[PDB]
Amino acid sequence: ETFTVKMGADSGLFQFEPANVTVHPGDTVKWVNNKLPPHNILFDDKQVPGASKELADKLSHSQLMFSPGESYEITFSSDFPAGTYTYYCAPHRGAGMVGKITVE
Ligand SMILES: [Cu+]
Ligand SMILES: [Zn+2]
Ligand SMILES: [Zn+2]
């Protein structure tokens, strides 16, 4: 299954929608740039399973997305550790533009 997460609410809120997504191994999360850019998608090293910086860095999309419809996806294949992957948008961090992917 692919779960889409809007970056920016349709109504002009600096939020990921849905902020929390539960996925199973093999599922994909697709972020779509919707409203109020720029956005990015950052996982801190201590915010992924096992606190792996290698993993968190590979998954982070630190570059800023400005154009509507720009996208980034992660397929949480069976080779990903189960657990929570908590992320945030740096440009809108102060607005609480955060989310969490729970694998399994
Ligand atoms: Cu943002
Ligand atoms: Zn850190
Ligand atoms: Zn389950």
Side-chain angles (χ1 to χ4, degrees), residues 1-14 16 18-34 36-53 55-57 59-72 74-103:
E1 193 173 356
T2 297
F3 301 89
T4 297
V5 176
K6 299 179 179 184
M7 306 195 281
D10 287 350
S11 69
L13 297 175
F14 303 111
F16 292 107
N20 305 324
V21 177
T22 300
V23 305
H24 279 82
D27 291 343
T28 297
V29 175
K30 172 174 182 190
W31 286 269
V32 180
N33 203 31
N34 181 31
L36 308 159
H39 307 292
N40 70 358
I41 302 155
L42 290 170
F43 300 89
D44 181 65
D45 47 294
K46 294 187 181 190
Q47 298 297 336
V48 307
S52 172
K53 187 172 181 293
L55 180 53
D57 287 350
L59 301 185
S60 294
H61 189 291
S62 61
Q63 290 183 38
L64 299 184
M65 283 177 274
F66 280 93
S67 192
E70 288 189 57
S71 60
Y72 172 61
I74 296 162
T75 297
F76 290 87
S77 73
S78 63
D79 75 321
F80 281 62
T84 61
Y85 295 71
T86 301
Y87 67 93
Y88 65 104
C89 175
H92 300 129
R93 186 181 173 156
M97 188 163 181
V98 301
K100 179 177 69 166
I101 298 166
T102 298
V103 178

